[PDB]
Design a protein around this motif. Sequence first.
Motif, PDB file in Angstrom:
ATOM      1  N   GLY A   1     -42.405  23.054 -15.469  1.00 52.08           N
ATOM      2  CA  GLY A   1     -41.827  24.136 -14.716  1.00 52.08           C
ATOM      3  C   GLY A   1     -42.180  24.024 -13.262  1.00 52.08           C
ATOM      4  O   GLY A   1     -41.557  24.665 -12.422  1.00 52.08           O
ATOM      5  N   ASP A   2     -43.245  23.256 -12.950  1.00 51.38           N
ATOM      6  CA  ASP A   2     -43.743  23.067 -11.613  1.00 51.38           C
ATOM      7  C   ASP A   2     -43.257  21.750 -11.089  1.00 51.38           C
ATOM      8  O   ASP A   2     -43.764  21.249 -10.090  1.00 51.38           O
ATOM      9  N   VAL A   3     -42.265  21.129 -11.762  1.00 54.50           N
ATOM     10  CA  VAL A   3     -41.731  19.853 -11.362  1.00 54.50           C
ATOM     11  C   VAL A   3     -41.064  19.953 -10.017  1.00 54.50           C
ATOM     12  O   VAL A   3     -41.176  19.032  -9.217  1.00 54.50           O
ATOM     13  N   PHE A   4     -40.449  21.114  -9.675  1.00 50.75           N
ATOM     14  CA  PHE A   4     -39.821  21.281  -8.387  1.00 50.75           C
ATOM     15  C   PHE A   4     -40.903  21.213  -7.337  1.00 50.75           C
ATOM     16  O   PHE A   4     -40.776  20.470  -6.374  1.00 50.75           O
ATOM     17  N   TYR A   5     -42.044  21.896  -7.593  1.00 54.71           N
ATOM     18  CA  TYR A   5     -43.163  21.975  -6.691  1.00 54.71           C
ATOM     19  C   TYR A   5     -43.769  20.624  -6.479  1.00 54.71           C
ATOM     20  O   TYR A   5     -44.149  20.283  -5.367  1.00 54.71           O
ATOM     21  N   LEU A   6     -43.828  19.808  -7.551  1.00 57.97           N
ATOM     22  CA  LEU A   6     -44.409  18.498  -7.530  1.00 57.97           C
ATOM     23  C   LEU A   6     -43.658  17.646  -6.565  1.00 57.97           C
ATOM     24  O   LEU A   6     -44.241  17.004  -5.699  1.00 57.97           O
ATOM     25  N   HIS A   7     -42.324  17.637  -6.687  1.00 64.24           N
ATOM     26  CA  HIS A   7     -41.497  16.862  -5.821  1.00 64.24           C
ATOM     27  C   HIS A   7     -41.481  17.389  -4.427  1.00 64.24           C
ATOM     28  O   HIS A   7     -41.475  16.606  -3.491  1.00 64.24           O
ATOM     29  N   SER A   8     -41.408  18.719  -4.234  1.00 65.77           N
ATOM     30  CA  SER A   8     -41.285  19.272  -2.909  1.00 65.77           C
ATOM     31  C   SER A   8     -42.506  19.072  -2.075  1.00 65.77           C
ATOM     32  O   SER A   8     -42.402  18.801  -0.883  1.00 65.77           O
ATOM     33  N   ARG A   9     -43.706  19.229  -2.670  1.00 63.77           N
ATOM     34  CA  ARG A   9     -44.934  18.962  -1.971  1.00 63.77           C
ATOM     35  C   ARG A   9     -45.019  17.516  -1.594  1.00 63.77           C
ATOM     36  O   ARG A   9     -45.492  17.202  -0.509  1.00 63.77           O
ATOM     37  N   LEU A  10     -44.575  16.591  -2.474  1.00 60.82           N
ATOM     38  CA  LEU A  10     -44.582  15.194  -2.124  1.00 60.82           C
ATOM     39  C   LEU A  10     -43.634  14.878  -1.010  1.00 60.82           C
ATOM     40  O   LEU A  10     -43.991  14.215  -0.043  1.00 60.82           O
ATOM     41  N   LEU A  11     -42.386  15.347  -1.140  1.00 60.39           N
ATOM     42  CA  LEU A  11     -41.312  14.906  -0.302  1.00 60.39           C
ATOM     43  C   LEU A  11     -41.419  15.367   1.108  1.00 60.39           C
ATOM     44  O   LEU A  11     -41.079  14.614   2.013  1.00 60.39           O
TER      45      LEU A  11
END
Lengths: 468, 50, 62, 56, 499
Positions: free
Chosen positions: E290-300
């Motif tokens: 559910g935090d996959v969006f957060y994972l990518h956004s923090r990285l990107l």
Amino acid sequence: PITGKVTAVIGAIVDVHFEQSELPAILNALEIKTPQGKLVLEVAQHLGENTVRTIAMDGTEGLVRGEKVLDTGGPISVPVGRETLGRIINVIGEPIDERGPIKSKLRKPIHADPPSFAEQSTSAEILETGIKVVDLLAPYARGGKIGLFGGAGVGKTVFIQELINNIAKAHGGFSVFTGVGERTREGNDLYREMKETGVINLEGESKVALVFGQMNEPPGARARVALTGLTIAEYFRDEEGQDVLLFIDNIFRFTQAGSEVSALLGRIPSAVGYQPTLATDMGLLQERITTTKKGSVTSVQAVYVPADDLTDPAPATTFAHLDATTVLSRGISELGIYPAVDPLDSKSRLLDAAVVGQEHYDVASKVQETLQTYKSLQDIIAILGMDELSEQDKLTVERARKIQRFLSQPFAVAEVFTGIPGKLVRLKDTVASFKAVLEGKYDNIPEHAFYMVGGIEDVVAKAEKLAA
Amino acid sequence: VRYEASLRQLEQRQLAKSVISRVQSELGNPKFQEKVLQQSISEIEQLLSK
Amino acid sequence: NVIQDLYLRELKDTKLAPSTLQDAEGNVKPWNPPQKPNLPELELQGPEALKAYTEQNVETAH
Amino acid sequence: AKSAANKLDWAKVISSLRITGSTATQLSSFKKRNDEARRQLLELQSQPTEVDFSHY
Amino acid sequence: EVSSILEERIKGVSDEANLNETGRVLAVGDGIARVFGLNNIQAEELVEFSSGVKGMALNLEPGQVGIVLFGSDRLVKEGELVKRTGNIVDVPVGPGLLGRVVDALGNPIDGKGPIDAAGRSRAQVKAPGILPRRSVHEPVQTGLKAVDALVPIGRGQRELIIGDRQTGKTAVALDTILNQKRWNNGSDESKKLYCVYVAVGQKRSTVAQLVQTLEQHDAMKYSIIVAATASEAAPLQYLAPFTAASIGEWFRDNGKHALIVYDDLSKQAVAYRQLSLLLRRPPGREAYPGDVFYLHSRLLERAAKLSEKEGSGSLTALPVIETQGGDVSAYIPTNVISITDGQIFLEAELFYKGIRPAINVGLSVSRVGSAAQVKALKQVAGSLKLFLAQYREVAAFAQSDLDASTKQTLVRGERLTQLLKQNQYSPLATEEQVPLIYAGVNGHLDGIELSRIGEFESSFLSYLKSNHNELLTEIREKGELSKELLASLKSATESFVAT
């Protein structure tokens, strides 16, 4: 004496409670003495309280909670050597060939770490196969994963057998036919066939070593058959310096087995029911296939599509690891062509201008372009009429149908089976043959006089015999 | 050259097994006892240094 | 401490492994000698050629 | 040198058009061009002729 | 010899341990350990187990701390003493990582000695502020026709590379690194990029082939490779993009322009999925966390072009998404698409049908990538993207009575398609691209039948250099067309087209 009393048997997940300061380690081997001899359980968790959680490799029926367990430590160690060539051994590493205990100098743990970044070889050399068709349209190569497609009965077994024969001439390496959840009916057949074609012969030569999986054996033992095979191969590669070729049966059943073991270990089932630990399990399996500086394993694996879904995660994960795909078809076999290889569906990673050689690449590209055009041309040529062929088009039809026939070559193993002695044609000569056919030097001789011919040299002979 | 490099690796694993042999010798000796004394006095120095 | 024990022991007791040239030879590809001068031989020789060419030179160029 | 040869080769092709019974002379010239290009590719392919010893 | 190296190592172990904090492991397995003690632990610290494996504390609970094992379970055993590293997860960053393959811990897996590194810097960091951003204007040249003008990319710019599985996805990026060989072998530090190739979820063999390819093209000396192979532990893979981005920031924070290619973030998603499920957190949408969006956004969002006040650097980012079944609708792909600006969707049908690389232009967009462009290649290439998305429409209904207007467009469109094609691992000069695009736009490729368009292109380039390399030298320095250049191109193109 590291011993413990069984404190649960919920499913095939048996928790064993050990007396203090004697605690196992993860991936240790426990052996529970039973009237079934022993049951080898492999420690896959520590649940604390001086209790562990293990998986079983043999049925847990009739266990009495509190039975003495003995800790053998580390991953199960299976005998290895040239002594194990031509011996059917079950997962625990005990004869199921019924030819009794195999005396093999060393035994080695079934889990082993993939070779280092440094140990990876920096180039992939094309492994030769007597089959010209293979060497043209999808060249095999060191450390390669070649994923078979098609159905059994096309001659899957014969294709595999042919490869073993080829490997013996080509390299003089070894093989290990590892069968993941192998159908026992088929297993009997394979043993009989392998004996019959003498790739296993009693006091005679034994190249292929057999590890046959069984669907009646627990899901855990289905998971571990592959790792056992891998170890045997690595002993050959690393410690006997020989190239190996390792067959795998369904890797769908590798995944399927893994999925169950995850669920038994109690983990949230990941998408499309598959294991959450899906990636890692393929990763370990398919990174011990590499080309080392001692040898190289090569693996032909069988991918049993799950309801023809190529979108499914298990196929996707497989395709990621795969380097080549060989796409056998029955349509091809119905055109009398044995090899059953569908030329426009087989592709390999190695098949590039520099990779497979410029000449070979160019020859291959032309032959591929020729076949590709031939099929398409035949679509409306057949319907409209053969008289509607252009001079250019019927040149292609002439060349192509002759190439198509030229592809057909008997197999050494299938010398009996087709009735025609096999033709093991070397890679250099494969290129040479197609070059001449491209140059129209050959293709002035009948279509059927390219049927079942071997190399270029062979159809010189057939031209003479055709005339005679 | 390839065998020369291989020989360096082979030597490294041979001398590694000699180190294991040295370990088996060390844990035998009452150097095992005397070095416990060495650890003891060192631990005293460490714990006093706190 | 243990460092000293290990250090002393390892260095002192150090083994010598095989490193024979004979053993090495087995593990390497052996030296090949020169490829031999050979002889470069060039086509068109003998009075076979002479008769052939005189005869060949008779086809009128139309 | 080689360029002279090739000018004569292609000149002879358009001359050979005008002479029948000399329809395989041009194939011999083509063969001469072929082997000239083959040996040239040999000479360009050429290994250094000395043993390496500064890394070897 | 070998003895001296051993002696160096024995000498290289020194001093007896001084520790005053530990925990002892409770239950361990599932790549999570529950430790008793370590009450003084920092949050998201790196801890070292007695097994020698290290892990990052995730769940600090009142009685237990839950380490996440960056490593394999076999190493660890229950009731081991875990001592705190004392540092939040940091990885060595510095100049000397240049030309080194490393794993995500920073252990050199090329093993070209211990890494020379200025510092270490924490894996997670907040992205530069609004005020620390200056809008892009310096382009990165890719040397690929369509990429370098129809879908142009900037510096610091975040633009997706999305497409079908193992369509040699990697190759598009490699070509960029190769094109910037003469930029990075350049002496202008502004023109120097330092490129990081993050290989995630990839076979160690395949990566080794890539390394060898790069070292064959002698590109290694300007590039770093971070490697997180499939074999490597799933949490380690999770931490792999974040760590790589830290290295990039050291270059960025030298004010030096850089690039990082994250191949493939789709494998990071699967890794994070594994981690999440093994942390027994409920599956998110499409069963991906559910935090996959957060994972990518923090990285990107760490990729940036720093403001002129606060440096000038950049860290360009191109993240490579492996589209399952090639369908861009799907939670993980769409989530990335929304984060990125521009996409480089690739079409398999076209790939098979010999457009190498096959840049689908229906699903390739570029927004702020076209704010960094060579003005010459803006003038010549104006609206050609529209024209070839009229070609797309035209051929949609071509498969019927075709009006002469449509037929003309189709005839141009098809001829243009031939022009688009590139040959893999052959990068093209920017200067050289300018005349070629002029020709096609001005419809001079009517003058060469479609089959011979390829012949024309090479011949045209040879012609251009021989006829007047003066034009190209001018475009080399001026980089903006003038009336003289425009006329010279009209004249030159007509001249070659005729012959």
